[PDB]
């Protein structure tokens, strides 16, 4: 239970730039009000064919 | 150039090794044609020759049933085993996000809005510049000013009509940036004064 | 118990394909032949119903010049290649038809070709060429070349006579007559071929009858083009020749050391390895007029000539190959901008092609 | 789901796109202020671009206030529309589906029924004037209009239940994920039975009211994916009941020719009793095309397990005193999953046979359930969704019983994300759940044919 | 192994498994009126009839005799592997898109290996070809070369101008070049790579290389060996194993159809034993020289 | 066990007829057979009480109650009037016919 002052839809980001930007750039990705790996927030990547 | 080149690059690929530096890894299923030391070396070793390779392995053109027999019976589930240990690292360390901070619950990132000393000029068009119905969110999220007394922010708010998603936006940015601050400027921490 | 020419066979599976065809009469309509190829004859293809009028090519591969001759490697190879093969700078083949004995393709159908300009230059007013369109062309074939070079492709064929332009200026060097796929050979080149591109332009490592000649004989080739486009003749204008299975080309090799100069040991590291080197041993010794000889040109100076001198050397180790001729001091150093379409400010149409009703 | 505005969630399919107008006759003053904000928050999370339609006079955009609701007003408003269409001659094809929201004064069936009326009217006084248009309707509550204490992070939820109406009709916001499995359990030689190991099952829920004639289906794949729901009024005769039955086997047999093979159907009939005249139908149209296997479902708990402990359940202690188990994350070991109370379905397979709630003529064989508790501490009975297998194809119905729930439990957790209940039934497959709705609010009118 | 991602067999062949059932099934539907007679069988007079279904259709039994005849001719006339395996390529996007029971298979098989060894730059002159073609086989071949060339003519209108296609065998050099890297720093015995080679040479059977790019069968096969070698107190010792599989995790080399190839292969071992030459060689015998 | 034979769905309704009878004689002449449910005369529980009777694979018969909360309320004299038998449903009692 957080105090409903703290779901803001949060917009002062920096991730304006690219995917695979070196090699696990998760820090700028997972921000928002709730920690995504509360939900097992899996990728999806594959070789694609 | 007029019209760009053909580099023939991979569409979106991941390569067989990421952890390699990042210009001598290559792609699966890929390979244009570039000079190279071992080329040079073949044409001026194998002129009046003809050069050709034979192939790797001794013995090709064979079926593999006699070379590899049982491979159903007593050897199955030793294949079954194997690839689910591969799946399972696959899904708990290559795409699952690691959430890396041990502070609170939300994402790392996620920082609020930051406070900057801004008088009334610029504050004064900025509140203009929320009123209207047509603006970003993005260059109006960068930044918001401080010492904003709510007497104002309600105030200004239903005198220069702003929309209603964005009020409660600005109210609970508000409420969020004071109680950050409030329990930051806190000496004592008691069970019941936090 | 032994078989005759009666047996069950492919059969019934004509009949229920036969039904069911496409022609040449169905999709296109003719035209008029425009003798390109005596191996094998191009027409000129209307479309079948601002104008929009007939832009296609078939060539007809009648190779009896009877009763079903196969394909030859000639039709194979090219079939194998063109198909799949895509760009830009190639010609887009739209489809294949089998007719009654022989193979119909049809690509797109083109302006001119670099022969009909250099025959537009052969009237005795002598347009020389202005260097921006040369070194636009120069641009353009450079990158499908490349294109060519780098998804390992061999081209053993390029002339003036089967490189083409359009309007809106767009080089297409539209003949894979005699490429070759040459990722995994498993019979060498000398044990396949024996023979390759056309006598006019060969390169000096096909001239001493290498068996493993490397994928630079292709920019030797574009060197010779570029040579012809910058003197309006053929640079080694050759003559032909006559147990030994070459007929070595014995006055081509001539021609070519009288304008170039001769090789040794420093120009040349391995040549005492190759079949008949005591062969090139009996010309005399020229040093070389090959600034004299672009000096009998046009006055563009001080960049051809660097790129001449790269193209034009019998060093296969040390050959230049295309993405590292696409930034040689030419294209980089502008006084008028290299584009795709090559006929801008040049407002003349050098004539439609000659068509035998 | 409803941390879905909260974290950006955006939909995997693409945008479907839409041009809105708002009627309402009641109160301008309040759907003035209402039908800006449902659009904005529409474009504004990324599900295409709700253009809000515009005539020419003082109206505020995307709205008719009328009054009146008659024949010569919605005859003039059609043609204002058709002349609008007329206008807007020459674009692409997607950029025009329209829809028209209209407004429950009370909200009840006599005026829903009414308000379909209207909208009829309106499409066929279009259509006959310009084909080709293709309009749809939604219907919100005035009070949902006019409560002030309808919160924006409410409107969402609205939006949601627009975009599964759009002419991309079978395509919804999500779907399930068709993850890696567990265990990998490569099929070498059997054991050598007449056991199968299906590919792709096909779910398919059809009912009949207690008077025998409304027929109500809802077809969806082992994903949830090719979503159809339709009811057929079949009134008192039995051609239109035969003709209903061989079209849900026409329905199921057009998206059974999508997949791979060795494909197995599963109808499930609602309410218990499962009669002759259906099963003489069902047993008529199969045949070696796809192997059925019939499933009768129960919802109401008429066989009723109490359940009776105070130690298993671990939100028990956390809901009798908040401070049993109450003990802080330790942030170092920080890897938990929020998991939502109402959604955790537990699965049990019986040790016999139960008979069916209804029709004594027939039992069962391999009964089983899903199993929701109640958020809540201490005795009392908890909810219940039972299943009961009656015709199963191949040998070894307990496997194919553990793998119609493990298919049930996916089937249940995504009707949250379609619009078709709210958090209250967690334990109940989301086509069931709609032919149960529309078993439950669609029987009520009376039909007269002319 | 130019480039298979924007190559012709990403694009105009290499559908998904709906799409080749589909391609089956009007297959099945085109087979269907042209003979609902059967097959007349007769060894002791003895005549029954098969349902149209009951077998030598396209589904297993006569697919490891073709694999056997193909590289029985090739071994025989002492060309490489590569145009075997792009002769197998042609046998089974040709059977594909027409039926066995109306096609001469043993001219179909030459006529394969005649078409793949003259693109694949290795050709085999025609008298040659049909001379082991007849010694080999004395009957089912006709003396006429230019029967067999017509045959050439209509596989070249089948199978519609896409002759080249990229093999495992270049993706198995490859992964096998990368293996020798810091991050591994592993390498097979050259036992176990031939069996490497001889499980993707046995994969060509069992109608996979039109659903997946080589790289993956490359894996699956590679994959069955080291796992098939580690083994033959801790689970997952010999830590090649260990190696390979971070391999194939670290890299995104997708499963699903690595798990496909291998269960393929499985089932491919598993119909190797019911499997004789006794009735699909009287069905060939009994449905030509009747 | 997928479709009855006609002796078990006899002995099912022989058994729940023996037990609606019984339970009615039992009791102080205050409950009858609705068909399949027990109401009082009296609105005592106002609900139905359905006993069901089954017998499992191993031979254990058991009967299973239902509490249905449907609106059965008995009717009198003073009830014939039109304020009652406009808008209500009425019902035969020991059948179950409308």
């Keep these: ?49 | ?194 | ?357 | ?450 | ?290 | 066990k997928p479709n009855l034979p006609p002796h078990y769905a006899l002995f099912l309704k022989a058994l729940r007829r023996k037990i609606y009878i019984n339970l009615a004689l039992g009791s102080h002449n205050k409950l009858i057979q609705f068909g399949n449910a027990c109401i009082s005369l009296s609105g005592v529980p106002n609900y139905l009480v359905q006993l069901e009777p089954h017998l499992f694979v191993n031979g254990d018969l058991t009967v299973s109650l239902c509490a249905k909360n449907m609106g059965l309320v008995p009717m009198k004299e003073e009830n014939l009037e039109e304020s009652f038998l406009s808008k209500h449903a009425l019902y035969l009692a020991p059948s179950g016919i409308r």
């Design chain 4, 1 to 450: 789901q409803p941390f879905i505005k909260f974290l950006n969630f955006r939909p995997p399919n693409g945008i479907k796109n839409f041009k809105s107008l708002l009627l309402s006759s009641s109160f301008k003053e309040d759907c003035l202020s209402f039908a800006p904000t449902l659009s904005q928050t529409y474009i504004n999370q990324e599900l295409g671009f709700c253009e809000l339609l515009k005539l020419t006079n003082e109206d505020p955009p995307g709205l008719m206030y009328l009054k009146a609701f008659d024949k010569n007003k919605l005859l003039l408003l059609a043609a204002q529309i058709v002349s609008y269409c007329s206008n807007n001659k020459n674009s692409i094809k997607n950029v025009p589906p329209i829809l028209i929201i209209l407004p429950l004064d009370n909200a009840t069936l006599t005026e829903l029924v009414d308000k379909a009326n209207i909208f009829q009217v309106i499409k066929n006084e279009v259509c006959a004037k310009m084909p080709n248009i293709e309009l749809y309707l939604k219907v919100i509550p005035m009070d949902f209009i006019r409560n002030v204490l309808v919160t924006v992070d409410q409107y969402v939820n609205v939006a949601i239940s627009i975009y599964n109406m759009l002419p991309p009709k079978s395509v919804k916001f999500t779907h399930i994920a068709h993850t890696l499995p567990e265990k990998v359990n490569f099929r070498t030689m059997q054991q050598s039975s007449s056991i199968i190991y299906y590919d792709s099952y096909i779910h398919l829920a059809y009912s009949r009211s207690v008077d025998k004639e409304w027929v109500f289906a809802a077809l969806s794949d082992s994903y949830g994916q090719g979503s159809m729901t339709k009811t057929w009024y079949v009134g008192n005769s039995r051609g239109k009941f035969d003709d209903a039955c061989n079209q849900i086997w026409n329905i199921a047999l057009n998206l059974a020719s999508k997949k791979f093979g060795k494909i197995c159907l599963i109808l499930t009939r609602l309410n218990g009793i499962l009669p002759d005249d259906e099963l003489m139908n069902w047993r008529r149209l199969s045949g070696r095309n796809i192997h059925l296997a019939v499933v009768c479902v129960d919802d109401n708990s008429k066989i009723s397990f109490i359940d009776e402990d105070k130690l298993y359940p671990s939100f028990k202690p956390i809901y009798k005193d908040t401070r049993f188990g109450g003990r802080m994350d330790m942030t170092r070991l920080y890897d938990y999953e929020i998991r939502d109370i109402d959604q955790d379905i537990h699965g049990i397979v019986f040790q016999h046979p139960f008979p069916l709630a209804h029709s004594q003529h027939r039992c069962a064989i391999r009964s089983g359930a899903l199993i929701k508790f109640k958020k809540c501490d201490g005795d009392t009975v908890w909810d219940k969704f039972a299943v009961n297998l009656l015709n199963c194809p191949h040998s070894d119905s307990t496997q194919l019983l553990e793998t119609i729930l493990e298919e049930f439990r996916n089937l249940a957790a995504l009707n949250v994300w379609y619009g078709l209940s709210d958090g209250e039934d967690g334990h109940i497959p989301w086509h069931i759940l709609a032919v149960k709705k529309m078993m439950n609010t669609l029987v009520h009118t009376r039909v007269k044919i002319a």
């Design chain 3, 1 to 357: 118990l032994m078989a005759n020419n009666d047996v069950f066979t492919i059969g019934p599976y004509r009949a229920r394909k036969d039904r069911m065809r496409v022609s040449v009469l169905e999709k296109y309509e003719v035209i008029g032949y425009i003798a390109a190829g005596t191996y094998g004859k191009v027409y000129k293809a209307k479309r079948q119903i601002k104008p929009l009028t007939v832009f296609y090519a078939i060539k007809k591969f009648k190779t009896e010049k009877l009763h079903y001759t196969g394909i030859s490697q000639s039709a194979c190879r090219e079939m194998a290649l063109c198909r799949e093969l895509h760009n830009k700078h190639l010609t887009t083949l739209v489809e294949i038809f089998l007719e009654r004995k022989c193979v119909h393709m049809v690509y797109e159908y083109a302006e001119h070709d670099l022969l009909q300009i250099i025959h537009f230059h052969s009237h005795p007013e002598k347009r020389m060429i202005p260097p921006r369109m040369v070194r636009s062309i120069m641009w353009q074939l450079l990158d499908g070349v490349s294109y060519l070079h780098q998804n390992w492709v061999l081209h053993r064929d390029l002339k003036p006579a089967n490189i083409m332009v359009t309007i809106d200026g767009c080089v297409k060097i539209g003949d894979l007559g005699l490429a070759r796929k040459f990722h995994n050979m498993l019979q060498t080149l000398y044990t396949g071929d024996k023979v390759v591109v056309t006598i006019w332009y060969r390169a000096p490592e096909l001239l001493l009858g290498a068996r493993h000649y490397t994928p630079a004989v292709d920019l030797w080739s574009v060197g010779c083009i570029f040579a012809e486009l910058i003197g309006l003749q053929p640079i080694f204008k050759g003559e032909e020749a006559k147990k030994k299975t070459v007929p070595f080309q014995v006055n081509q090799l001539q021609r070519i050391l009288e304008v170039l100069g001769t090789p040794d040991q420093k120009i040349w590291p391995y040549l005492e390895k190759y079949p008949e080197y005591d062969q090139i041993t009996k010309f005399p010794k020229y040093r070389d007029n090959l600034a004299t000889w672009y000096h009998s040109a046009g006055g563009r100076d001080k960049h051809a000539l660097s790129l001449l001198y790269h193209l034009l050397n019998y060093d296969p180790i040390k050959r230049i190959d295309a993405f590292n001729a696409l930034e040689h001091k030419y294209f980089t150093e502008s006084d008028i901008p290299v584009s795709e379409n090559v006929f801008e400010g040049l407002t003349y149409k050098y004539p439609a092609r000659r068509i035998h009703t």
């Design chain 2, 1 to 194: 150039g007029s019209g760009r080149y053909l580099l023939t690059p991979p569409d979106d690929l991941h390569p067989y090794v990421p952890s390699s530096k990042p210009q001598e890894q290559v792609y699966p299923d890929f390979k244009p044609w570039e000079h190279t030391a071992a080329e040079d070396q073949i044409l001026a070793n194998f002129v009046a020759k003809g050069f050709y390779h034979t192939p790797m392995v001794n013995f090709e053109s064979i079926s593999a049933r006699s070379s590899v027999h049982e491979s159903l019976v007593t050897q199955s589930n030793i294949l079954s085993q194997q690839f689910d240990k591969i799946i399972k690292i696959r899904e708990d360390h290559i795409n699952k996000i690691p959430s890396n901070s041990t502070t609170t619950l939300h994402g790392p990132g996620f920082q609020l809005p930051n406070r900057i000393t801004l008088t009334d000029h610029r504050k004064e068009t900025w509140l203009h510049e929320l009123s209207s119905s047509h603006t970003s969110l993005v260059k109006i999220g960068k930044f918001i000013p401080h010492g904003l007394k709510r007497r104002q922010v309600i105030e200004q708010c239903y005198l220069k009509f702003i929309p209603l998603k964005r009020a409660i936006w600005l109210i609970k940015c508000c409420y969020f940036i004071e109680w950050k601050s409030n329990h930051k400027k806190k000496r004592s921490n008691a069970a019941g004064a936090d």
């Design chain 1, 1 to 49: 239970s957080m105090e409903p002052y703290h779901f803001i839809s949060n917009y002062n980001t920096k991730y304006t730039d690219d995917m695979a930007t070196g090699s696990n750039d998760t820090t700028a990705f997972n921000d928002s009000c709730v920690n995504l790996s509360l939900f097992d927030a899996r990728f999806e990547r594959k070789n694609p064919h």
């Design chain 5, 1 to 290: 192994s130019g480039s298979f991602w924007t190559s012709t067999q990403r694009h105009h062949w290499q559908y998904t498994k709906a799409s080749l059932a589909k391609e089956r099934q009007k297959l099945w539907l085109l087979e269907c009126q042209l003979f609902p007679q059967g097959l007349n069988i007769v060894m002791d007079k003895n005549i029954p009839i098969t349902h149209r279904d009951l077998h030598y259709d396209k589904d297993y039994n006569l697919r490891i005799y073709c694999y056997f005849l193909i590289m029985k001719l090739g071994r025989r006339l002492n060309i490489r592997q590569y145009a075997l395996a792009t002769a197998h390529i042609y046998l089974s996007r040709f059977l594909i898109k027409a039926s066995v029971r109306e096609i001469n298979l043993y001219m179909l098989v030459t006529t394969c290996v005649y078409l793949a060894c003259k693109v694949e730059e290795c050709p085999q002159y025609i008298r040659t070809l049909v001379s082991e073609a007849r010694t080999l086989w004395p009957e089912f071949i006709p003396p006429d070369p230019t029967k067999v060339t017509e045959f050439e003519f209509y596989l070249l209108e089948e199978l519609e101008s896409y002759l080249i296609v990229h093999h495992p065998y270049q993706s198995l050099k490859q992964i096998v070049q990368v293996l020798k890297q810091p991050p591994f720093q592993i390498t097979l015995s050259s036992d176990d790579l031939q069996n490497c080679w001889s499980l993707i040479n046995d994969s060509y059977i069992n109608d996979v290389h039109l659903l997946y790019p080589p790289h993956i069968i490359a894996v699956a096969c590679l994959f069955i060996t080291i796992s098939i070698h580690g083994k033959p107190p801790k689970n997952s010792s010999s830590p090649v194993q260990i190696a390979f599989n971070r391999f194939m995790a670290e890299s995104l080399v997708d499963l699903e159809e690595v798990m496909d190839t291998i269960q393929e292969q499985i089932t491919l071992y598993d119909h190797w034993d019911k499997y004789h030459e006794q009735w699909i060689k009287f069905l060939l015998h009994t449905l030509y020289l009747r």
